[PDB]
């Protein structure tokens, strides 16, 4: 009970993450590195960041590429924060957030030059996203998504159980690449995100908001179980990091 | 007859390539990009470039990384050229070439910080190199090799026949990554080399030496069949490039 991520209201899991810049591992270097594999864009390019959350990673993407960037998320609270940050970053003219589904995007067929997504705020699955987002991408356009992947053929039961529950579609890197290619994209590149994408840019920032959050919800049993949960995930990383991590996959629609 | 690369003396195939800087696709950008995935080195690092040929790619590697770089090749003519170029590049103090086998290197166990190899001058196979060169690499050190790979699940019979003859161990990218990981390296990254690694840095340079070579060997039937052969490979690229190419694979010994 309360040991699984599936055991929490969505308006609850988000009431916590709206306090953070990133809802998943990542970094300015990792984003910059993924961009080094796509074609250069102009101010007239159309880019979509699916499951943008509060937009932390979306703003770093805007520093490395030109074009109109539309951030899409299911939770309206995240979008509200996203537009506030774009305003605070003085780029709300080219960086806009809207609410919407990840499996039925508000775009025309072949309207985008780039599709971007870094594991955060719900997930429809790697294979499904590869095949479904395709229609919205111009031919020759690029897709770049970061995802939790297995780094070995087999791992300790503890980490496997964890993922078979949190995200059952997690697979070895070879399988992700195979799925990217079958979805019609040339598998341009893949690279494992450095440890700092986890510790420095994801876990640490949570140490900041911890205090206020605890003071406020120390009386709420469900909230304290959520916290013990996040702390569990952090300790799972320090312990099993050699068996899993985030991987950036970049591909070009054929 | 003479339609296969296996139909030519080795002292013959090399009498042609010693006239070129690269014996295979590649570029300063592709080399620079592979280096962006390994750890920074000092002047005391030990690096080995297996199957270096005349050293064209080895000198670009020396521009992006510090350390003593030893280029290794089977053919003594290539090594002689390699050391001449290092001299012409004023770096023969840190960049040296020696003759030797690719499957029994002149190094101690865990002596190297980096192992490098870009498809050129014979090949022992991806899987075999991954497993055999390991012993010479320090734990945590990196390996970075570029190799011809299939980009799709199936291709036209013409290109398949060609490779099943030229290099039968050619496989899809997922299989290469799987082999890298089983050999004990964390599969850090992979990326397809841009077209210019083929046209600009590999095929074009051959247009330069063509004239003199032809004048000299126009009377030699075996030499003219070798030339028609290279021209065939160039035309195979323009025709089947969407089905194959070179891929840089970078990994970290666990």
* Alpha carbon distance A253, A131 (integer Å): 11
* Length of chain A as a residue count: 254
Please report, to the nearest 10 degrees, the dihedral formed by the alpha carbons of residues A44, A46, A47, A48 taken in order: 150
A210 is in an annotated binding site: no
A12 touches chain B (CB under 8 A): no
* Alpha carbon distance A136, A99 (integer Å): 17
Cβ neighbours of residue A213 closer than 8 Å, sequence gap 6 or more:
A16, A19, A223, A227
Dihedral pair phi/psi, residue B92, rounded to 5°: -75, 0
Q: Quote the radius of gyration of chain A (alpha carbons, Å).
A: 18
Asked if residues A50 and A82 have their Cβ atoms less than 8 Å apart, the reply is no
Chain breaks in chain B (C to N over 2.5 A) after: none
Give B30 to chain A, closest Cα distance, Å: 11
The neighbouring-strand residues paired with B3 are none
A227 is in an annotated binding site: no
* Interchain contact, A189 vs B188, CB within 8 Å: no
* Alpha carbon distance B96, B68 (integer Å): 8
A37 touches chain B (CB under 8 A): yes
Q: How far is CA A94 from CA A26, A97, A111, B109, in A?
A: 22, 10, 16, 54
Cβ neighbours of residue A147 closer than 8 Å, sequence gap 6 or more:
A119, A126, A170, A176, A246, A247, A249
B152 touches chain A (CB under 8 A): yes
Structure tokens at B133: 């060169």
* Alpha carbon distance B204, B225 (integer Å): 19
Cβ neighbours of residue B219 closer than 8 Å, sequence gap 6 or more:
none
Give A221 to chain B, closest Cα distance, Å: 40
Asked if residues A43 and A66 have their Cβ atoms less than 8 Å apart, the reply is yes
Asked if residues A191 and B188 have their Cβ atoms less than 8 Å apart, the reply is yes
> Helix axis angle, B28-35 relative to B56-64, nearest 10°?
50
Domain A1-254, architecture per CATH: 3-Layer(aba) Sandwich (3.40)
Q: How far is CA A105 from CA A102, A164, A185, in A?
A: 6, 28, 19
Cβ neighbours of residue B234 closer than 8 Å, sequence gap 6 or more:
B203, B206
* Alpha carbon distance A154, A144 (integer Å): 26
Asked if residues B85 and B115 have their Cβ atoms less than 8 Å apart, the reply is no
Give B28 to chain A, closest Cα distance, Å: 15
Cβ neighbours of residue B251 closer than 8 Å, sequence gap 6 or more:
B142, B143, B144, B180, B181, B185, B186, B187, B188
Look at strands B244-253 and B137-150 and give their pairing. antiparallel
Give B142 to chain A, closest Cα distance, Å: 14
The neighbouring-strand residues paired with B56 are none
Q: How far is CA A202 from CA A83, A119, A207, A229, B234, in A?
A: 21, 12, 10, 15, 48
Task: Give the CB-side neighbour count of residue A194, counting CA atoms within 13 A.
Answer: 15
Which positions in chain B touch A188 (Cβ < 8 Å)? 191-192
Closest CA to A221 of A10, A36, A12, A11: A12
Structure tokens at B203: 């095929």
Cross-chain CB nearest to B177 (options A152, A177, A188):
A177
Closest CA to A243 of B176, B190, B181, B39: B181
Q: How far is CA A19 from CA A53, A229, A252, B8, in A?
A: 11, 17, 34, 67
* Terminal C-alpha separation, chain A: 46
In sign, the C-alpha dihedral spanning A81, A87, A91, A96 is positive
Asked if residues B15 and B222 have their Cβ atoms less than 8 Å apart, the reply is no
Alpha helix stretches (DSSP H) within chain B: 10-17, 28-35, 56-64, 76-88, 126-134, 157-166, 173-182, 204-217, 221-240
Asked if residues A248 and A126 have their Cβ atoms less than 8 Å apart, the reply is no
Asked if residues B117 and B50 have their Cβ atoms less than 8 Å apart, the reply is yes
DSSP, residue by residue, B204-242 = HHHHHHHHHHHHHHTT-HHHHHHHHHHHHHHHHHHHHTT
Q: Which residues of B117-149 are buried (b: 16+ CB within 10 A; e: fewer)?
A: bbbbbbbbbbbebbebbbebbeeebbbbbbbbb
| Burial bucket for residue B114 (CB in 10 Å: 0-12, 13-18, 19+) | buried
A173 touches chain B (CB under 8 A): yes
- Give Dmax (Cα) for chain A: 54
State which approach was used to obtain the coordinates: X-ray
* Alpha carbon distance A63, A32 (integer Å): 9
Which chain B residue lies closest to A183 (C-alpha atoms)? B152
* Alpha carbon distance B116, B126 (integer Å): 13
* Alpha carbon distance A182, B200 (integer Å): 30
Return the DSSP state at A168.
T
Q: How many Cβ atoms sit within 10 Å of the Cβ of residue A108?
A: 10
Structure tokens at B102: 């690719």
The neighbouring-strand residues paired with A50 are A72
Return the DSSP state at A109.
T
Q: Which residue has the tokens 């506030």?
A: A84
Asked if residues A69 and A95 have their Cβ atoms less than 8 Å apart, the reply is yes
Q: Quote the radius of gyration of chain B (alpha carbons, Å).
A: 18
Domain boundaries, chain A: 1-254
**Residue of B126, B152, B189, B248 best to disrupt the A interface, most CBs of A under 10 A:** B189
* Alpha carbon distance B92, B158 (integer Å): 44
* Alpha carbon distance B106, B112 (integer Å): 11
Element (H, E) at A220: none
State this model's resolution in angstroms.
2.3
* Alpha carbon distance B115, B138 (integer Å): 10
| Burial bucket for residue A211 (CB in 10 Å: 0-12, 13-18, 19+) | exposed
Q: Which residue has the tokens 């959350």?
A: A53
Task: Give the CB-side neighbour count of residue A252, counting CA atoms within 13 A.
Answer: 14
* Length of chain B as a residue count: 254
Dihedral pair phi/psi, residue A110, rounded to 5°: 50, 50
Which positions in chain A touch B254 (Cβ < 8 Å)? 242
* Interchain contact, B181 vs A152, CB within 8 Å: yes
């Amino acid at each position: 009970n309360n040991t699984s991520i599936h055991d929490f209201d969505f308006s609850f899991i988000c009431n916590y993450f709206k306090l953070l810049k990133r809802q998943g591992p990542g970094s300015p270097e990792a984003t910059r590195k993924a961009v080094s594999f796509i074609n250069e864009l102009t101010d007239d390019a159309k880019i979509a960041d699916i499951g943008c959350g509060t937009g932390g990673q979306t703003l770093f993407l805007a520093d490395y590429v030109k074009g109109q960037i539309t951030g899409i998320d299911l939770f309206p609270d995240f979008i509200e924060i996203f537009n506030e940050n774009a305003v605070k970053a003085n780029c709300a003219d080219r960086v806009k957030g809207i609410t919407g589904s990840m499996d039925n995007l508000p775009f025309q067929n072949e309207e985008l030059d780039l599709i971007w997504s870094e594991g955060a705020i719900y997930n429809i699955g790697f294979e499904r996203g590869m095949n479904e987002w395709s229609k919205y991408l111009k031919k020759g356009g690029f897709i770049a998504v970061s995802e939790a992947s297995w780094f070995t053929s087999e791992r300790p039961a503890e980490i496997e159980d964890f993922w078979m529950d949190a995200y059952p579609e997690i697979s070895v890197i070879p399988t992700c690449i195979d799925k990217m290619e079958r979805a019609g994209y040339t598998p341009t590149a893949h690279f494992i995100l450095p440890e700092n994408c986890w510790t420095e840019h994801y876990f640490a920032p949570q140490d900041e908001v911890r205090e206020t959050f605890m003071k406020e919800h120390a009386g709420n049993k469900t909230a304290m179980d959520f916290m013990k949960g996040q702390q569990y995930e952090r300790s799972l990383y320090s312990k099993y990091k050699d068996y899993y991590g985030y991987v950036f996959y970049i591909g070009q629609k054929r």
